[PDB]
């Protein structure tokens, strides 16, 4: 509903502070550009400039107030804002290949990074020797991991990878917490355990989610697919094939409703039903260049804005067409009339 | 009669592979190269396809992450044709970097072939670049039967006037 | 590059910033009298035709803004001599030209205020007027025996032309 | 070299030098124009070429080339038709051909001329010489030269725009190029005006053809403006000449004087302002500045084979007022230092073959063995496709 | 231009200035110039011993022994009669022309001079026409080779008179664009009736490899009698050069298509960003 | 030495993880049941075995079938199939346009039009995607 | 010695490549060892001058002396190292892929391809530029195999890259391929069964 254009070229990833008050994004750049809102406009106020190679993955520790970035210069670089500027402390990830994606754990002791060099950097910070450090989750990933989502607990971690898997696994470090409670995901939670892998063999997984509770993990693939497994139900899977393009992200709305977006270009709900252990159709939530859908290229980023993966009330899009919309639930709800959430 | 429904499978099958993103290379430290042509992860290889319309005239669709590869077996009902259609082939792929989509050289057993990446998804409109494979179909149909009458037409004029000036 | 003046002497008088220099003259005004075979004026006549076709003139001295100044007037006695039908009628309009007030420095319609100071009070303001009008008079004289055959096409050519693309009017 | 010689060609901007390698002059000198209809049946063949087109009643004029650039290659490709098959009358696939082009053409632009040349008329070899590169050569006729040499500047003024390119071993120094305002054309509209405010009776539809004739008639370069002009106001007699002309519609005879122009015209190549408001720098200068742009260890055998090519150079003592005012500006840059250097040899080339230095250099190498081996062949062209055609071996000083 | 032009404008033009200048008075300019012409004919245009009152025009063609046993030098010397001198060493004919001494209409003999080569080419087929109208039937054919592997033959019968040219593709393709044009003239009568009849072969010659092709040019006596003989030579010896000079132009004008269509779809590629 | 393609024993390469009754199909197709022929005729695809031949068996059975049809017979038949149906028929039908004979690709062009609209172009995606397809 | 320090290290083999020459420094214990310190003659400007050259054949000519900052710049911007030249060459010669618009100081606009791997590809084929040699891959394995068994393993592991002209994108994958190749051929005499063991990383680091 709400768009707005910050480039006619990619946004290749995204991430707002705790307010909302402002967003940073890549400009298809080795650099971050950071916007704020003033009244009904946007304001640029700041450019992170340090990756030496394009930006693939951006996010932002609300509390703490710290951006992180990766890059495919195979570097990633925590940002703390210094009085007005923000300063940038280089992290050695060990790894030979681009980084893909990252994202902070909600605790915020620790993020993940995603590359190609077919491992899951997990970096935690020494206050004892003053530099960031990592361990690497390797098996048994076979190939570039393409996005990840943290549990509430801040030690499972979902992972979507091109060797067409989804997986949980453990991120568990214990220089910077607590032994994790249990899970229905599996009770024994050791640095690197794998928790979870889906049985398909197709389709490479662009986006996995996991629920407000974390009892439930959904990814969307390549050969427009998209699934739910809950620990719930024994870690069932349900599976729905949709007649259109690929999704590249997804993100809960509710415990049981999903929405995301990709190569169609407009962002589209996804109900699930836990007695019937089945997923449903929920229909095009963006309904009316030369196309009819706010966003002109694909959509390759979805978070939520306000009221958490629990009750989210509004949620936020950029895609390769440069543009950032802003949804409200709400309203899609009244402009819909028959549309069904949760 | 054949050619709507030919073209319109062909369309389909494109807006299904041309589905890119940007990829850094897990085979070689900080490269990017078009998948489909280095071929050097197997599990980033879609399924190669052809649409046929008949034993002659085919499109072979290769995609993958971040690149597509479409081969385009052009129709040459005689001789004639066969020298016109080679041609212009050519011609354009001889201009191949005014035509960024364009492969310098064809997939042996086509006439014409394109490799379209990433960042032509990314600068261009996707349904836009589908809409330009199917012009371009039609289209160089169409100019190979104009050049064909050419030849034809200014072979006459030019065999009358040397004759009818004894 | 143009021609400039090379009267400029280690003791020659200035009137403004323009130099006084001598002309061999009967004409009134504060002139020096001139014992040399040459002056300004015939520097001026002789380097004009060349000159003329300039646009750029560097002022070297102070002897080059009375140049100027002089192959300005020479264009104005052009315009006026052509139309004229002897080398006697010539003669009058080249005294009716030499008295009218042009502009000076410092005036609305001087065309060079950037370059010439102005005078600084009454008196530079008169003496200026007197030489400049001394000039004109002396100028249009022995310019009007050049000019004049009849006044020769090969002079005539050159009243489209303007010196710096400036003009005394 | 076989039986046959072969074919020279130098399109201009202006005007198309063409012939057979061997002789001294081309055998045409032809307006670089073409006249078409203004496409079903031979429409495309209905077109003139040279003088034949200039003046056709029905026939549209055109100028394939711009800045010594082809604009148009439909239009330059049937132009070559007829520079073969009735002008130069050789079957295409019997000679080797040598084209030449302008320092900024584009790689693109010489495949552009090679899948022309052998995908339309088959020819069996053909080789794109660098103009700047066949000036130097051609200049090698001159005496004041001793030793062959491919390093020097070359000051090409046609038509168009002059070029100052200096040379070092036979390749350009591209990045060092540089281009003056000023040239043919410019010289003549000048030469036009100055016959507009003062001499009458001439025909209005011939204004630029008299200015022309007489640029090229009676026009040169003097040492001093006022010592000149002050020579034709003192003997009038002597300096003053006269061109007469034809009425081409009353069909009879104008005559004017000719008289400042003669020297004014050639003048503003040093000074510029003279004519044109948005260029001041003498030619001179611009020479110098180009020269010490380039490497210094090369400055001096640049300075010291200043060589001429194209019709704007043919002015009488061009050469002369040239090397003149660069040898002061490089003595009194040099003088400074000291009061804050060997003495820097200024020499600037005149030969005979000036007129059409390219052609004449481009006649001499096609002459010579080397240059059929350098010659990039239809075999070659064919296997490895017209790429081959983007570098073309330079040849004729080292050996 | 459709048909070539059959006269030699480096030789007029050469001459021309020659006789405008000896015919002003001013002191003859020195000439030395080599130049070509179709099927491997050299010229030469020189001042002989260096004399420059004296301006030689010299052809060399590799064929002319063959043209030579067909009447050629009887030929040649009633056109150009005393301008005909010694051939120059290296070539085959040379006409001479004294400055000093010219006739009074000059562009008579300045035609002629452009027109050597046609004129070496011309008693062949004299000849022949000349067989026909004396109904002379069973002589010796005519065998002509104008290039290193083309050839001509010529051969009269009671009422025509037959051209046989054996000409060359080079390109494996020019032999279809060739077939095309043939074709053409195959049929031309269903466009001039009384026009000569053309026949044509892909590899194997007439009654009288893959790139070789046999045009059959049928003359009759409207075509080779003494009043259409010289325009009729005119054309049938260029016959062969107009061919291949219209397939290279066809190439040319598809080029020009080709340009316009790429350059288009250079226009739509482009408009599909944003 | 480096001729050999030193990657191929690379161990962080990847590495990937029969058919219809002829008699069934032939008796529903004799019996007028096209739609049940369908059906039938992708029953069990040959999607795990290493043999080309057991698959072109499969597919002829399939193309067989398809072919048989009546061009106003195919919309009602599509129909009837369930979404992963329309998957699987997509791929045959893409594996039919390998083999033009007989105006055969006529046809799998209707049929393909059919299956598209039933399908939508997530089918064609899904054929594309598959690691071991017919 | 300095190298290996800033990466917390003692022992492994360095390779420097900058603007005049390429070394090979094995380090042991925390001292040098100049017996087995080899040298390569190839290096930066020999790179930079060989980019003027395929500039050439393309139809660019660059003067040595003029414009020798001007390729530098693009030769830095542009050229990376081919993993495998028969797949880069594939790239060059049948796409486009490789082609990239370069702006002079002029304002002239330059494509370049295939000449950005071509380029630095005299670091492994010294022949290209009139160099006898091994080639710094090559030689690179030669410093370690003509050294102590026991402490073979060690150098293998512990190879790091300093030096501007070690910066091309793609080398470090180029000299894992490379050494592998010879490890497989000059040492497992032919069996690939036991390449896989053979343990072999090279450090990139961020910085230097
Ligand atoms: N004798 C002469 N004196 C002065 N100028 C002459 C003389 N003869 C010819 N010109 C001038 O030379 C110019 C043509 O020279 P040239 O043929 O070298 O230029 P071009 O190659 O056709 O064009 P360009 O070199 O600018 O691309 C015309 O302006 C012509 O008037
Ligand atoms: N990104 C790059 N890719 C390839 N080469 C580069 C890059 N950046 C710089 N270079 C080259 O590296 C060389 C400079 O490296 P460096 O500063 O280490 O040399 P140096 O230490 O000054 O001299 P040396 O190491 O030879 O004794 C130059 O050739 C420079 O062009
Ligand atoms: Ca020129
Ligand atoms: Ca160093």
Redesign the pocket.
Known sequence: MAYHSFLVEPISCHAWNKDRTQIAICPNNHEVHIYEKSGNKWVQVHELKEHNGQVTGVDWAPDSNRIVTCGTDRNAYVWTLKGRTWKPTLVILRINRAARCVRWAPNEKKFAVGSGSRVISICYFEQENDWWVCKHIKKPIRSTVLSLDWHPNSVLLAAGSCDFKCRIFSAYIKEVEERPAPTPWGSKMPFGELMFESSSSCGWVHGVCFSANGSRVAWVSHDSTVCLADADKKMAVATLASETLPLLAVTFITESSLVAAGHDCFPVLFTYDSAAGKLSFGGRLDVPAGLDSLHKNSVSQISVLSGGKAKCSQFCTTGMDGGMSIWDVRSLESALKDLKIV | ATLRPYLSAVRATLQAALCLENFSSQVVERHNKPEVEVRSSKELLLQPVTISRNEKEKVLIEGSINSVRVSIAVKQADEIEKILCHKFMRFMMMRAENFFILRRKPVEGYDISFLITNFHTEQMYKHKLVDFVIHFMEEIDKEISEMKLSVNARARIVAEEFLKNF | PAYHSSLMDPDTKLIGNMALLPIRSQFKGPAPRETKDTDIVDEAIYYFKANVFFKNYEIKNEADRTLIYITLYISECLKKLQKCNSKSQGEKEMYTLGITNFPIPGEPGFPLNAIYAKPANKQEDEVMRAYLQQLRQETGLRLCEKVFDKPSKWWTCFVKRQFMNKSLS | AGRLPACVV????????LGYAGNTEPQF?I??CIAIKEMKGVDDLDFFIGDEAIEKPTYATKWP?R??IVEDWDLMERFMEQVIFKYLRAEPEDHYFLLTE?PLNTPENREYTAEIMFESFNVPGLYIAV?AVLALAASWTSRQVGERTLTGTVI????????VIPVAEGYVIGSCIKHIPI???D??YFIQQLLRDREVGIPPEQSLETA?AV???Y?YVCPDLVKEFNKYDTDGSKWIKQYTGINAISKKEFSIDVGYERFLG?EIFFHPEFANPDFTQPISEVVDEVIQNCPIDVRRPLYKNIVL???????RDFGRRLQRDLKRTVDARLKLSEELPKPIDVQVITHHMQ????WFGGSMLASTPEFYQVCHTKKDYEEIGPSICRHNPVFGVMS | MILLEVNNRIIEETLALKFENAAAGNKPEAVEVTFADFDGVLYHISNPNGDKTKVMVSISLKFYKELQAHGADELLKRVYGSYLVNPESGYNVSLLYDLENLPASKDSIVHQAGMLKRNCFASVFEKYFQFQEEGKEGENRAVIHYRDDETMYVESKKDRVTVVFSTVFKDDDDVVIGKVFMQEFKEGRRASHTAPQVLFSHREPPLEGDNIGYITFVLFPRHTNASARDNTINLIHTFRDYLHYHIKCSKAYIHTRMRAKTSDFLKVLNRARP | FRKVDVDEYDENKFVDEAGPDEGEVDSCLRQGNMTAALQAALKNPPINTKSQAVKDRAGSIVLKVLISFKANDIEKAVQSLDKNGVDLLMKYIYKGFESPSDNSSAVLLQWHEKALAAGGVGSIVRVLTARKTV | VLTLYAQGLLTGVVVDSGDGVTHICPVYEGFSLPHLTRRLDIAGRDITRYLIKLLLLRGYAFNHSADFETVRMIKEKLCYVGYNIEQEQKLALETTVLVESYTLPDGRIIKVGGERFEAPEALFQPHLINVEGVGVAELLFNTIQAADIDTRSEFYKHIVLSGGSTMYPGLPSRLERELKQLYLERVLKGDVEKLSKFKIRIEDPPRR
């Not at chain 4, 090409?156 to 070029?163: A, K, Y």
């Not at chain 4, 090519?309 to 002015?315: A, E």
């Open positions: 130098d399109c201009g901007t202006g005007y198309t030098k000198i307006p670089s080339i800045h010594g302008p103009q090409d003024s046609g038509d168009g725009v002059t070029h040239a043919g054309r010289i003549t022309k640029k090229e008639r026009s050639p090519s194209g019709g704007s150079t043919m002015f007129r059409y230095a390219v």
